[PDB]
Structures are given as C-alpha cells and as structure tokens.
C-alpha cells in the first residue's frame, strides 16, 4: 500500500495504489473515503483495522455535518482524526496505519494537506508519501508552492514513473483524485 499527496496553489492531488490483497486473485479505490464534500482521506496499513478506523471517522464526520448543517474545516477534521487515532491505541498494541487528509478550506479559500502516522503525529505538508522504500529527492527538487494543477499532475506522473521501475508488473497502477473549490473529482483519463 502506497499513498502520495501533493498540494498545489489551489488544489490537492491524492494518489493511491489500486489493490494488493495477500494471495487472492481478484479482478475488480478501496483506500480512500470521502469525509466531506471538500475533504478526502487516503489510508494505508494493516488489513482490517485501517478500514474500520476510516469508516468510523467517516461516520462521525457525516454525523457532525448533519447535526450542524455545516461543513467542518480540513484543520478540524485532521485534529479529530488525530485524536481518534491516538485514542484507539491507548489500550492495545498499535497497528500500522498512515493517513493523508486533503481538503479545500472555503473560509480561507485554500487547499490543505495533512499527514498522520500510526502513533498520531499530525504534520501539515506541501507533499507527502507512505509505503515506498527516496522519492523525496525528486519532490524536493521539482516542487514550488505556486504550481498549477497541470504542473502538479506532471510532478505526480514523474513520481509514478519513478515508482513503476523497481516494482513488478503486479503493480496494476494508481488512482488519482483531486480536491479543489468545486469538490472532489477522479482523474480518469490521466
């Protein structure tokens, strides 16, 4: 499971691997949940626990949106996720989980990207990744805050080409989604 995220001047681009499930032959995006109409969550980690956690978070955020008739901010959503993740492992052995939260804050009119690790450490980032043995050299060299959506997609494509060179053909590909002022879209053709 590999997840990637890049924040460009007016958008957030999240990429997730398609499917790897033990030794089961499947044909068939199971690693993303839409928390809010302008907030998307990508997760990667241990099978079973991670999906339970993501669905729990989604149910809570939908309950909040229904109760208040209002959309929670990406920062508040990230804080709630961090609190819940820290609380879940307070009385049990920790499980592998890594989360990227990407949103578009309407009040500030800005894209936002956050990364939360398995212990509950939240970091606001311009770019982030998990699951790859790095790619941070290319991101460090070829990233600017004022990049457009097309330039961010080009950087993501270069990163994906780098990834798909030491991976087997069993690596089917990557699904790309974009969060911006109009909501959440899936990059189908590209």
């Amino acid at each position: 499971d590999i997840i990637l995220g890049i924040r460009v001047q007016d958008s957030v681009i999240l990429a997730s691997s398609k499917a790897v499930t033990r030794g089961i032959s499947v044909l068939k995006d199971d690693k993303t949940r839409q928390l809010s109409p302008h907030t998307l969550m990508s997760f990667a980690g241990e099978a079973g626990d991670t999906v339970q956690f993501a669905e729990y978070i989604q149910a809570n955020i939908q309950l909040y949106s229904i109760r208040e008739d209002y959309e929670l901010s990406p920062q508040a959503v990230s804080s709630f996720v961090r609190q819940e993740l820290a609380k879940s492992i307070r009385s049990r052995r920790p499980y592998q989980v890594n989360v990227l939260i990407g949103g578009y804050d309407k009040k500030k009119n800005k894209p936002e990207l956050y990364q939360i690790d398995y212990l509950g450490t939240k970091v606001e980032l311009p770019y982030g990744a998990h699951g790859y043995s790095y790619t941070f050299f290319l991101l460090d060299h070829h990233y600017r805050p004022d990049m457009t959506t097309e330039e961010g997609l080009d950087l993501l494509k270069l990163c994906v080409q780098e990834l798909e060179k030491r991976m087997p053909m069993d690596f089917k590909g990557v699904i790309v989604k974009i969060v911006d002022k109009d909501g959440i879209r899936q990059v189908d053709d590209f």
Partner: protein, 215 residues
C-alpha cells in the same frame, strides 16, 4: 481513576522497535532526647552532576521528617500523599500526628502497589509518645532502628555509625556523628558529595532544619 495504565502496550511496542524510553547518602540517628536525620546534597542525572545543592530532607509533618532513595518521583509523590493524609487525620482528631500513624499509612500504601512504587525511606520524628526512627522498603516492609543508613553511600556511613555510636548521646554528639557519616559517604562514594543537610527533632521543641550545616 488513579494512576493510569494507558499507553502501556504502546510503550512496550516502542521499546521493542528500538525507541529508548527516557529515564545519595542518608542517615538517621537517635539520641537521648530526640532524633536527627542527615543527607547529602548532590543530585546527578547519571554521571553528570545536575545540582550541587539539592534539598533531600522532606517534611511529612512539622515534627515528622523523611528522606528517600530509589525513584525520585515516586518518593516525592508518596511523601506528599502521606503528608496530606497525616494533616487531615490530625485536623480530624485534634491531636498531634504520631510517627506510627505515618508508618502504617506508608506501609499499607506501598504494600498495595506490590513493590511497583519504588520508594525507600528513612522516617524520623517526635510525637507526644516520644522519638521514633524507621526504615521503609518499597515492597511494604518496615523496620525500627537506633541508627540507619540509606543510599549508595550507606555502607561507609554505616561503618562510621558502627564506630562511634553509644546508648546515651547528647544533641551535639548525635549531630556530629550524623555529619561525620554523611561526610564519609561524600568522600568515599561517587554518588554523594557537596554539602550536608541536617534536621534535629527534640522532644518538646520545634524541629530545627539546618541546611548546608557543613559545606
């Protein structure tokens, strides 16, 4: 409620995956009309001297004092909790606290936690029944002694005490003997050093706390 067990599994997991969890001479001497407690004043975080003037003599009550070794946070917390209980009991009974009462409270509290609270104490005091000196172990066992030593420098201090102790000691003789034991611990043990703190509790008088008695 009480001391928490949250993040125990998480801390064990971090320890298994290479995450380092971050991390004294005391004597008590009875004399003919009271008791003295003395201690060194060096505080070290490992081999590094954190503080050259550290107060290790702690007050359970105005005329009941104690010093400790082992886990410092546990020692301080247990001493303060028993001091609160002693003060409340004294207010309830309208009487001066007894050293035996503090001994019972400390013993039962330490036995309840089955040795997981690492508090090793010397407790001296004077109450309307007389003067008392006690040693208290972490697992909940207590003992009575005419002269006691504690800490990493306790063997040198015990040698000095065994050399120069008598049944009938004046206040000055006891103060000198306790100071000499602490000085032996200071000179001959790497964990002890700097100055000496003394507290003298005499029957019928206020407790006299002499910080930096010998520098």
């Amino acid at each position: 409620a009480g001391l928490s067990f949250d993040n125990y599994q998480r801390n064990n997991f971090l320890a298994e995956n290479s995450h380092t969890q971050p991390k004294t001479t005391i004597v008590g001497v009875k004399f003919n009309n009271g008791v003295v407690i003395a201690a060194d004043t060096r505080s070290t975080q490992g081999p590094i001297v954190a503080d050259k003037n550290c107060a290790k003599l702690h007050r359970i009550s105005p005329k009941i004092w104690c010093a400790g070794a082992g886990t410092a946070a546990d020692t301080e917390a247990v001493t303060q909790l028993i001091g609160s209980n002693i003060e409340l009991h004294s207010l309830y009974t309208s009487r001066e606290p007894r050293v035996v009462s503090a001994l019972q409270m400390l013993k039962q509290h330490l036995f309840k936690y089955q040795g997981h609270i690492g508090a090793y104490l010397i407790v001296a005091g004077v109450d309307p029944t007389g003067s008392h000196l006690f040693s208290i172990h972490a697992h909940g066992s207590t003992d009575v002694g005419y002269y006691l030593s504690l800490g990493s420098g306790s063997l040198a201090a015990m040698a000095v005490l065994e050399s120069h102790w008598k049944q009938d000691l004046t206040k000055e003789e006891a103060i000198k003997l306790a100071s000499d034991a602490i000085q032996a611990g200071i000179w001959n043990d790497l964990g002890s050093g700097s100055n000496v703190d003394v507290c003298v509790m005499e029957i019928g008088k206020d407790a006299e706390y002499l910080r930096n008695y010998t520098p």
